[PDB]
Design a protein around this ligand. Structure first.
Ligand SMILES: Nc1nc2c(ncn2[C@H]2C[C@H](O)[C@@H](COP(=O)(O)OP(=O)(O)OP(=O)(O)O)O2)c(=O)[nH]1
Ligand SMILES: [Mg+2]
Ligand SMILES: [Mg+2]
Ligand SMILES: [Mg+2]
Ligand SMILES: [Mg+2]
Length: 342
DNA sequence: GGGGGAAGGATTCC
DNA sequence: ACGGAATCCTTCCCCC
């Protein structure tokens, strides 16, 4: 039918930092995104397992991590460095399959269907792949294998860290009845909560609800998706994803509604967005703002032609004025998003 | 009635 | 309480 091998690097940023300076190995390490409002304002991109053990993890405020692990090593996120180490590892996986889908900066799916036969062999390719990457980049990863992407992913979540796991057809059927619906990719709190209200705490539970009811509660897309899995029929193909948006949105020292105060961060945001666009030309631009109450508002425009930096500079100000004009709150984080490339 | 698109937002964490 | 980016949903539009 189809065999899928999913790969997710371990505590990726923190692991790259250790590779670049092995002396860190053994110590708790926290990679941070310092927002700049004060001393250690900002959040944790991620931490290695040593630190993750005391609750220090992605999303919590640096200050909170500091309280728990005052003597851990705190490093600023250096996405560029990790990005290259990522590309290299992606180039290796290509040697095992042309059918490759690079999900994120740290996980990719490979269709090894017409490359291996039966799971025992798939599992072997898994080990080679792990030992390979460990050899070249000295980066440990986890591998998950199953009949479709989703389950492949879940097998890896189950196998982390530095593991490898196969979820065969018999287990897929068991998991469908056992797996907690919220442990299914694409199911966050918002959706999980709504799901409980229909008494659907497991994948299988969805097979006993009028589709119309589901659709109405969580949307057609999410419902078809879920019923599909439950039905042991989910089978999305593994295709390379193509970049559709490029943008950057920074945090200001202090909240504001003053145009001459905000402009600079905005122009800074446009600049980085363009050096990142590289040779790509966008016809759509969106100015995004995170209000003081962490709400997210946006205004944009699509031109019948590509956008030059001059046009973006000028047009973003208008959109920014539209936002202040249309929203009473102060602005906390401001930025831009370019899309609809030519 | 409904195709086709653009805009603002919701939800996910891929 | 950081932040990059995809997918999907609702509403509004113009029009045949
Ligand atoms: N800046 C930032 N980075 C994040 C955030 N969440 C995750 N990341 C980064 C850090 C990870 O190295 C990279 C991959 O994330 P994963 O969720 O797959 O976990 P990671 O590999 O970090 O640890 P793992 O051993 O898989 O549990 O994504 C976030 O909220 N902000
Ligand atoms: Mg990972
Ligand atoms: Mg990942
Ligand atoms: Mg979940
Ligand atoms: Mg994660």
């Amino acid at each position: 039918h189809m065999i899928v091998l999913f790969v997710d690097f371990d505590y990726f940023y923190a692991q790259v930092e250790e590779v670049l300076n092995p002396s860190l190995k053994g110590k708790p390490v926290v990679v941070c995104v310092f927002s700049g409002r004060f001393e250690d304002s900002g959040a944790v991109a991620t931490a290695n397992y040593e630190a993750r053990k005391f609750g220090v993890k992605a999303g919590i405020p640096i200050v909170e991590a500091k309280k728990i692990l005052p003597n851990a090593v705190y490093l600023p996120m250096r996405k560029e460095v990790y990005q290259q180490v990522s590309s290299r590892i992606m180039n290796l996986l290509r040697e095992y399959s042309e059918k490759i889908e690079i999900a994120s900066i740290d996980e990719a799916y490979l269709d090894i269907s017409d490359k291996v036969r039966d799971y025992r062999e798939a599992y072997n390719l898994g080990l080679e792949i792990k030992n390979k990457i460990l050899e070249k980049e000295k980066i440990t990863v986890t591998v998950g294998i199953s009949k479709n992407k989703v389950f492949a992913k879940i097998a890896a979540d189950m196998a982390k860290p530095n593991g490898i796991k196969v979820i065969d057809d018999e287990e897929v059927k068991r998991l469908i009845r056992e797996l907690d619906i919220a442990d299914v990719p694409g199911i966050g709190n918002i959706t999980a909560e709504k799901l409980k209200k229909l008494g659907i705490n497991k994948l299988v539970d969805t097979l006993s609800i009028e589709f119309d009811k589901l659709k109405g509660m969580i949307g057609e897309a999410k419902a078809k998706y879920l019923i599909s899995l439950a039905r042991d029929e989910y089978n999305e193909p593994i295709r390379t994803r193509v970049r559709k948006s490029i943008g950057r949105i920074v945090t200001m020292k202090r909240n504001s509604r003053n145009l001459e105060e905000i402009k600079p961060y905005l122009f800074r945001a446009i600049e980085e967005s363009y050096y990142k666009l590289d040779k790509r030309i966008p016809k759509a631009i969106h100015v995004v703002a995170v209000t003081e109450d962490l709400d997210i508002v946006s205004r944009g425009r699509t031109f019948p032609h590509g956008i030059s930096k001059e046009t973006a500079y000028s047009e973003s100000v208008k959109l920014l004025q539209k936002i202040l004009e249309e929203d009473e709150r102060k602005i906390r984080r401001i930025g831009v998003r370019f899309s609809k490339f030519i």
